[PDB]
Amino acid sequence: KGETTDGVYRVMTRRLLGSTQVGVGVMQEGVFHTMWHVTKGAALRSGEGRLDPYWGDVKQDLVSYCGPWKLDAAWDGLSEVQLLAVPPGERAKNIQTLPGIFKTKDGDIGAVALDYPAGTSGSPILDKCGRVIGLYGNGVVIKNGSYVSAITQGKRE
Amino acid sequence: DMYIERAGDITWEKDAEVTGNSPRLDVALDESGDFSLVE
Numbered sequence A: 001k002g003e004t005t006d007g008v009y010r011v012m013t014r015r016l017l018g019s020t021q022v023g024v025g026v027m028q029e030g031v032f033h034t035m036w037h038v039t040k041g042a043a044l045r046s047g048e049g050r051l052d053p054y055w056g057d058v059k060q061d062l063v064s065y066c067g068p069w070k071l072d073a074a075w076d077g078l079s080e081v082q083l084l085a086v087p088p089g090e091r092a093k094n095i096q097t098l099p100g101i102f103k104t105k106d107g108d109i110g111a112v113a114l115d116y117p118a119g120t121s122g123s124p125i126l127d128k129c130g131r132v133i134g135l136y137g138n139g140v141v142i143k144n145g146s147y148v149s150a151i152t153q154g155k156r157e
Numbered sequence B: 001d002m003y004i005e006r007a008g009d010i011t012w013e014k015d016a017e018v019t020g021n022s023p024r025l026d027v028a029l030d031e032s033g034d035f036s037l038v039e
């Protein structure tokens, strides 16, 4: 009722001036994956279709719609990756980078040093096989003033 | 009230713009899902 085709999608709101892009997500095996801070767990329209939240976690900053988190590929810790960035009002665009590392007390996470508008949050990070290894949008401002995103990945059950 | 619009396929693209650096940062993750720099 609704558009279920795999691929990357814009998350929009009409609640502000005109139509505003609040973020991005991934449609895979009938499940919509985005970052929690994009929707705050609200329902989504796809044409006349309704997408209901299914799983989420404010601390991982992830949420899935219509089903369990499906994306399980991981950064191998060595190879360059592609941010499929979907910036607001601009075309989807691949950017190839070698991720850095976030060192935490709970262990090491891949990190992409690529600056984009907050409305880009949810944009997928891909391996050379085209597998989604995580989403962009949760990270930190460095001394430079620039932005570094975790490669945020959920668990498949 | 939020809605979605398709924006592309998820494909690796040979000869994309290669950019950004690869820093090693010490970070903390708080209960509200906000990373911060340990320093």
Ligand SMILES: O=C(Nc1cnn2c1CNCC2)c1cccc2ncccc12
Binding pocket: A037, A061, A116, A117, A118, A119, A120, A121, A136, A137, A138, A139, A147, B032, B033, B034, B035
């Ligand atoms: O909106 C941002 N980030 C955000 C908002 N709420 N939350 C977060 C991340 N922790 C969970 C809660 C953001 C701020 C500045 C720069 C960005 N660059 C690229 C993606 C995103 C951001």
